[PDB]
Unconditional design. Sequence first.
Length: 115
Amino acid sequence: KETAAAKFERQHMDSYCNQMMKSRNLTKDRCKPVNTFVHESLADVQAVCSQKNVACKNGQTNCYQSYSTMSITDCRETGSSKYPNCAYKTTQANKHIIVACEGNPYVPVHFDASV
């Protein structure tokens, strides 16, 4: 088993899109429709677990929003996309991230949104 934290790191850490989505194995069983990569240090992202507590989209209370904006990339599939040619539009932005944190140590296990 990978672990949710490791999966989080695989899917969302990258201190473009077709290639990274391929590299991280997000085009494997299918083309994952959308995914965000974060271009900050792992430590900066992990510290988010002690920042602004906010509700998760699913209604759980263990989500956290970064006090600072962070450099991210949104990968969002194109219409012309078909596996194994999964095709993605890349969109850069600087936004606050919201992640769900769990476990001991208390670390990100889910990317919820950016604002």
